Design a protein around this ligand. Structure first.
Ligand code: MG
Ligand code: MG
Lengths: 579, 735
DNA sequence: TGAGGTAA
DNA sequence: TGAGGTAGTAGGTTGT
DNA sequence: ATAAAAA
């Protein structure tokens, strides 16, 4: 079907045109600018009973598509500002950022007011047209006139095909067409995971069950929760052994007081230095949220990467159960799952067990067909720390390694890449035909030259043939370069809908966008694009994009829900908590 | 665009043979037909010819001369050797009971003779394999309901729709044993059970319990049925389970006996499973239509007639369904809301309805009465929260209806949990101490902390039914009121919960205004017929609603009825109200339509005719130029029609637009109204209309009923199913 | 802190 | 009980 | 206009 893009054609000059548009848009009375490419209206909504007003506006940019014309890209935006008191300073009619505060997306002040910024395809694509028709007119080409148009770009947008996934005991899942098979794709994915189990059948390490003491928690609620979790995790991964329990005292709760005793008293005496463990956070009674947040941060970051910790909340565990009066026995005082509250508890337990398996490096499934390139590398530079993932063919081999970054950082990163590649290439992917680095953020050539040095060393040792191999670097943008929005024009009563999963748009032969969220999943609003840009190398961009999209279908955290990032960057974000 | 319907065409009627063999009167004829059909094992197609009634029987089966013991006398019944022939192209109305009954019987027999199926009633067949992966103690069974159709194109159709049943996993074996026969007996009598009985599954109604199988004489009988069974019921049956007595759910016969092991128990969709189930049976258009197509292809194939073949086709009917247009609404200070086409204005219809009501207030601007704010005392619920809630509610009401005076507070204590002594203590002591017996008020239910369930609703029910004619109240729950304010002393609404409290208050105030008979809005254009009289009788109580043109005049009237006295009361009420109200609101009425819920026995038409004759005697209304009739509205549709729209989107099926109608006969139609501009999950359900008497036009009545559907007074932001007259009757008339 | 996208 | 619809009938061949 | 109570 035909698709509608968010591109209004203008019928080098890039910076000159941007200057003209910015200068003419800054003169509008009901239009105050906030960034180089962000504007807002000088009025809040009506019927807002809070102490914070919201400000509508639009995001604007220019595009240089391959057709041979310049285009305008427009998308909505929203700001939150308190009314009674960075600041918004005043000088006559000239208002600019530097006596009112500008709020951030965090804290409870804005969290209750967020549905106003989410618009579906029809509402969003009519608001964009209204903004174009109203404000984006009477624009001047300095002395001349600029024809900012309407009736947005209509194109036949192609899409990738959903790859065939590989599960345990074979039992693959493949999509043949736009039939009832694809309609239940996410449900089939989750059901196959639940039935067959995880693909990785390697042995387990030692796990623990460190929970609060008896003075704060009962001795039967924890027993029932542990038994249910053990049953589910044994059904999923049959190699699980046991879930031995550690009890630690509360010792009041004001500010990080329990953290001092947590390591030296109970953890050191029981020799629990090595393991994975599971922690229940004490908030059963009335609690101060700041203490719980600080406790979570200190529990995750106090220990170095040994004993990686996945936590849980005691409130939900207690709410999911009921204190039965053990009718039939004496003194059991056990807790049971409420009969009307079984499905939600099952979903809770499934998600928690999946998370604990992810932190245990047991991947649930993989792709049946090999990707076009053998080696994929994901590098992220966390605060003062860095993380690397190595992704081999199909997805059966994913390796993760953290590192402390102390310049000599390039030397350390190059050494890490060299040793990891020389250790792992002969084991999993002998004679690779291509190495791709996927870097989150911005690239400066350090990773590319490190890969070049490692390739030269490996060719000196004869591991990989230099002539047939290729290497390249691609950059992932979590915030898109330009806010591209597309919709599918249909015959239904609502004439627009979200694009299908896999719709790609290449702006330049080295830059493009992928819409992973789409038809087989359900979302509120319009899908946002994931932006990729290949910087250097001798790769084919189309193959890299197809492999990245196939990596997006590997949703290890929530298989039922959709996934926005490829599994390598998502795994870094999950397993790279500070230190 | 085209719409895919739920009908499958029988493309073999051109070569089907057919044959013949031959209130109190209607009941006697029905009884005669039931008795002959029971003894001949076939369909009865009772025919009227030459002012006489005969029972139709196909010529293959014989019929022996005898007598049937009727109530006045035992009428002799006799075979008539004359046999009549019906061609494929002459199915005139006297023969309409024929063809229909023959096909029905044949299809029911062949469907009940299936392996992986069983029948629940005359027209519902379910699978014997329940839904997999249910963690509760309730099995969900999925099946279909079918019906025959006589669409005016000239062909018979099969209408098939999905259905679900909820049955516990095991009943009468692990629930009651011989040691507690008299303990829980009263918790099972009068219910509906499923009996397997080998490979002949049927539903039953239990008349009580009995002795055990080893003593009641019936062993070696069930062992015969479980021997030739595809299910190993040998382990199920043990000589310890007691013998239960059953009858058929249809009518009364002798009290048969059977064991308690094979009997499972069914649930009507009110006892339990609410909000823990009922979400598995909600299916969208594409999924439901795919399941229907699979059922038709799986079981409605290679069907056999008596000697021929039944060629039921596939690819269900594809037509072009027409629709009515959305009427234009009228609000306070004019402020019309009209829809010009399929544009953005149609998209925000419900939201703009609510916004216009919020901005402009209610349209009815008459005076008010004395109001109360029945609320717990100072020790329970305190006083500062009460004062803040009262201030906010008063501000909202005065913003909505500017004739509001005040909100006089009344305090009551709670004491203990009795639900009957607290009934007298709560509203028969403090309200009787004051002069607060006439008014409207609104009560705040005490549910602050650790309130016990299963009684508060009972209390609430009592609170809705003591002083009904003089103290019509609207309830509210203190748990939700206390969930917004938090102590700081003084009480202030929390900053995070500001929109939620606003929505709660707006809906509560709108419901309280509806109790006060202050209609928020009305239609702009007049209806085709001036007067609409909606009648609805249930639970010994009757309710009438008089709707004048435009709806600016909607008058509700409750009545108590106990059957000739009932008809006299109905006639008196209709005549008195019409004579009182016609000269005021509708001078020289053009027509009178009685929208009746349920089934019409002809009493309404007689009452309307008598009232019209008396009115013409008074000279108020004419006789040559006047129309009057009765239209029956069915809450549960006769044939289960479903409509979906064909679109090129990724989901190829969509719900039809609001107001899409399809008529099957000259006097039978279906309307779909919960469609596009509103948001629902699942498929829209039809509304069924059919005339009974009178000389009205059916198109005008259908369009006016759809126009009345668009008047939503309870929740303006959501969809509506019933027309405003029946919806108002159901909202009021709480006892 | 059960978890995803959309909002930023 | 702030509220809406979607889910949900009637229940004649006979099935000891 | 808002998220549930509802794979
Ligand atoms: Mg987490
Ligand atoms: Mg109510």
């Amino acid at each position: 079907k035909d698709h509608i893009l968010n591109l209004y054609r203008i019928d080098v000059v890039y910076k000159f045109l941007d200057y003209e548009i910015r200068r003419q848009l800054g003169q509008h009375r009901d239009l105050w600018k906030l960034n180089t490419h962000q504007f807002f209206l000088r009025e809040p909504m009506k019927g807002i009973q809070g102490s914070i007003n919201v400000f509508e506006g639009f995001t604007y940019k220019l595009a240089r598509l391959a057709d041979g014309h310049f285009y305008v890209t427009l998308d909505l935006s929203t700001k939150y500002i308190d009314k009674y008191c960075r600041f918004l300073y005043l000088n006559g009619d000239n208002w600019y950022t530097i006596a009112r505060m500008l709020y951030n997306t965090k804290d409870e002040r804005v969290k209750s007011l967020h549905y106003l910024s989410i618009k579906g395809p029809s509402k969003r694509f009519e608001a964009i047209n209204n903004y174009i028709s109203s404000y984006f007119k009477n624009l001047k080409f300095n002395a001349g006139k600029l024809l900012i148009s309407n009736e947005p770009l209509v194109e036949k947008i192609k899409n990738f095909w959903i790859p065939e996934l590989l599960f345990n005991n074979n039992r693959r899942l493949k999509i043949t067409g736009f039939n009832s098979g694809m309609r239940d794709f996410a449900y089939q994915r989750k059901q196959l995971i639940k039935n067959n189990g995880v693909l990785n059948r390697t042995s387990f390490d030692v796990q623990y069950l460190l929970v609060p003491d008896e003075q704060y928690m009962d001795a039967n609620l924890v027993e029932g929760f542990k038994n249910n979790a053990e049953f589910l995790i044994k059904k999923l991964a049959p190699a699980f052994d046991k879930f031995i329990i550690i009890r630690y005292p509360v010792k009041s709760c004001t500010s990080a007081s329990v953290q001092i005793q947590e390591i030296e008293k109970v953890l050191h005496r029981r020799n629990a230095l090595h393991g994975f463990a599971l922690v229940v956070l004490p908030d059963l009674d009335a609690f101060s949220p700041a203490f719980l947040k600080t406790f979570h941060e200190l529990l995750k970051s106090k220990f170095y990467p040994d004993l990686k910790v996945q936590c849980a909340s005691a409130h939900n565990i207690s709410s999911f159960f009921k204190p039965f009066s053990t009718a039939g026995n004496n003194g059991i005082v056990e807790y049971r799952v409420v009969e009307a509250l079984k499905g939600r508890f099952s979903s809770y337990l499934f998600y928690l067990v999946l998370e604990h398996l992810i932190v245990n490096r047991k991947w649930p499934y993989a792709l049946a067909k090999n990707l076009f390139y053998d080696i994929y590398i994901g590098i992220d530079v966390h605060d003062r720390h860095a993380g690397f993932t190595f992704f081999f063919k199909n997805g059966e081999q994913i390796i993760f390694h953290p590192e402390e970054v102390p310049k000599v950082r390039a030397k350390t990163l190059n050494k890490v890449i060299y040793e990891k590649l020389k250790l792992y290439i002969p084991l999993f992917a002998p004679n690779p035909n291509g190495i791709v680095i996927v870097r989150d953020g911005r690239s400066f050539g350090v990773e590319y030259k490190a890969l070049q040095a490692a390739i030269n060393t490996l060719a000196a040792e004869g591991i990989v043939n230099k002539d047939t191999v290729k290497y390249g670097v691609v950059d992932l943008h979590k915030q898109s370069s330009v806010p591209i929005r597309i919709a599918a024009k249909t015959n239904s009563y609502d004439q627009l809908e979200n694009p299908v999963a896999g719709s790609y748009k290449l702006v330049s032969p080295k830059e493009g966008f992928i819409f992973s969220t789409g038809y087989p999943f359900d979302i509120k609003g319009t899908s946002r694009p994931l932006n990729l840009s290949m910087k250097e190398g001798d790769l084919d961009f189309m193959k890299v994009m197809e492999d990245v999209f196939c990596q997006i279908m590997l949703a290890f955290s929530a298989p039922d829900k959709s996934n926005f990032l490829p599994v390598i960057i998502k795994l870094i974000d999950t397993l790279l908590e500070p230190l | 665009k085209d719409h895919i319907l739920n009908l499958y065409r029988i493309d073999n009627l051109s070569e089907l043979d057919f044959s013949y063999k031959l209130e109190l009167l209607n009941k006697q004829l029905q009884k005669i037909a039931e008795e002959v059909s029971s003894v001949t094992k076939g369909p009865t197609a009772v025919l009227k010819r030459n002012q006489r009634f005969f029972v139709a029987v196909p010529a293959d089966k014989q019929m022996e001369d005898r007598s049937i013991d009727g109530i006045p006398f035992s009428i002799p019944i006799k075979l008539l050797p004359e046999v009549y022939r019906i061609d494929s192209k002459d199915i005139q109305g006297h023969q309409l009971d024929v063809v229909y009954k023959f096909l029905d019987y044949e299809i029911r027999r062949q469907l009940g003779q299936h392996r992986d199926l069983w029948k629940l009633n005359t027209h519902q067949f379910f699978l014997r394999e329940p839904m997999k992966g249910i963690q509760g103690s309730i099995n969900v069974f999925e099946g279909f309901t079918y019906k025959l159709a006589r669409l005016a194109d000239g062909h018979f159709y099969v209408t098939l729709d999905l259905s679900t049943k909820y049955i516990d996993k095991y009943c009468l074996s692990h629930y009651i044993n011989e040691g507690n026969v008299r303990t829980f007996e009263n918790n099972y009598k009068g219910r509906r059970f499923l009996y397997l009985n080998g490979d002949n599954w049927y539903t039953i109604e239990l008349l009580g319990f009995g002795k055990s199988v080893k003593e009641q004489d019936v062993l070696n009988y069930i062992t015969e049925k479980i021997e030739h069974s595809r299910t190993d019921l040998k382990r199920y049956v043990k000589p310890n389970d007691l013998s239960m007595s059953y009858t058929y759910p249809g009518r009364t016969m002798d009290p048969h006996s059977g064991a308690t092991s094979l009997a499972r128990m069914l649930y009507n969709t009110k006892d339990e499973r609410v909000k823990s189930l009922h979400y598995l049976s909600i299916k969208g258009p594409s999924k439901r239509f795919e399941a229907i197509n699979n059922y038709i292809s799986s079981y409605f194939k290679n069907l056999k007639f008596n000697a021929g073949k039944l060629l039921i086709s596939n690819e269900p009917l594809v037509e072009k369904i027409k629709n009515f247009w959305i009427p234009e609404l009228l609000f306070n200070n004019n402020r019309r809301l009209k829809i010009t086409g399929f544009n953005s204005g149609m998209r925000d219809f419900a939201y703009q309805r609510k916004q216009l009501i919020k901005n402009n207030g209610v349209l009815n601007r008459t005076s008010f009465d004395v109001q109360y704010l029945l609320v717990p005392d100072e020790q329970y619920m305190d006083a500062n929260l009460v004062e803040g809630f009262k201030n906010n509610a008063e501000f909202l009401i005065k913003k909505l209806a500017p004739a509001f005076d005040k909100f006089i507070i009344i305090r009551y204590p709670v004491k203990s949990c009795t639900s009957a002594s607290v009934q007298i203590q709560e509203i028969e002591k403090v309200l009787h101490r004051r002069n607060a017996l006439h008014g409207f008020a609104l009560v705040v239910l005490p549910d602050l902390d650790a309130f016990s369930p299963a009684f508060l609703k009972t209390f609430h029910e009592l609170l809705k039914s003591k002083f009904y004619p003089d103290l019509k109240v609207q309830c509210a729950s203190a748990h939700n009121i206390s969930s917004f304010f938090k102590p700081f002393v003084e009480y202030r609404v929390v900053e995070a919960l500001k929109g939620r409290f606003s929505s709660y208050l707006f809906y509560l105030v709108l419901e309280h205004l509806i109790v006060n008979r202050k209609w928020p809005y009305a239609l702009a254009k007049n209806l085709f017929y001036d007067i609409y009289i909606g009648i609805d009788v249930h639970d010994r109580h009757a309710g009438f609603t008089f709707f004048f043109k435009n709806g600016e005049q909607i008058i509700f009237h409750p009545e108590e009825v106990p059957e000739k006295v009932r008809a006299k009361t109905l006639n008196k009420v209709i005549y008195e109200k019409l004579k009182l109200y016609i000269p005021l609101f509708a001078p020289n009425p053009n027509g009178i339509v009685i929208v009746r819920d349920g089934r019409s026995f002809g009493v309404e038409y007689k009452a309307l005719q008598a009232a019209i004759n008396t009115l013409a005697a008074e000279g108020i209304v004419n006789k040559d130029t006047v129309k009057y009739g009765v239209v029956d509205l069915h809450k549960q549709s006769s044939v289960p029609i479903r409509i979906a729209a064909k679109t090129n989107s990724y989901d190829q099926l969509e719900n039809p637009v609001a107001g899409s109608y399809k008529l099957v006969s000259p006097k039978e139609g279906f309307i779909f109204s919960t469609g596009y501009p509103f948001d629902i999950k699942g498929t829209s359900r039809p509304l069924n209309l059919s005339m009974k008497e009178g000389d009205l036009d059916f198109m005008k009545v259908m369009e006016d009923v759809f126009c009345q559907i668009m008047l939503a007074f309870s929740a303006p932001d959501k969809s509506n199913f019933l027309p405003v007259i029946i919806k108002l009757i159901d909202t009021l008339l709480e006892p």
